[PDB]
Point group: C3
Chain length 61, copies 3
């Protein structure tokens, strides 16, 4: 019955391999943090400068 336990572990390993394979695919569809950071910084900067110009225009009208 060590055969019995080795079967058991054979099948657990098989399932783990499939689980890991699918997680790997899930991961590659997730966004990089550096990509979030860079895009948001760019947008934040453009929005900030727009706020200032709008502010200046309010003082002229």
């Amino acid at each position: 019955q060590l055969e019995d336990k080795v079967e058991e572990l054979l099948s657990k390993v098989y399932h783990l391999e499939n689980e890991v394979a699918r997680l790997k695919k899930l991961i590659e569809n997730k966004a990089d943090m550096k990509q979030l950071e860079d895009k948001v910084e760019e947008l934040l900067s453009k929005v900030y400068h727009l706020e200032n110009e709008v502010a200046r225009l309010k003082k002229l009208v």
Copy 2:
């Protein structure tokens, strides 16, 4: 002592199952890249058009 090595692998498999389970939970809390892409594109478009209107308003004042 093949029993000894089969114990060893039993416990490594147990730990792997728990590791994989927790990574699965971590993954489901991460942002999809398509979601980052779509939101940023929308914001980028709105900001671009705002820049143009602000530009036009500067030429009128």
Copy 3:
């Protein structure tokens, strides 16, 4: 030849441990969804309010 199969599983477990270790590193470089959500909400709000002020300024010029 149960030794033979136990070798086989020993090496599959070894490879899985390395695979899981590297995925764990990949995961920690991905963006949290709540972080995407919060940053985009903030930017969306600022853009919305800019659109309104720009709209109001167009009616004054």
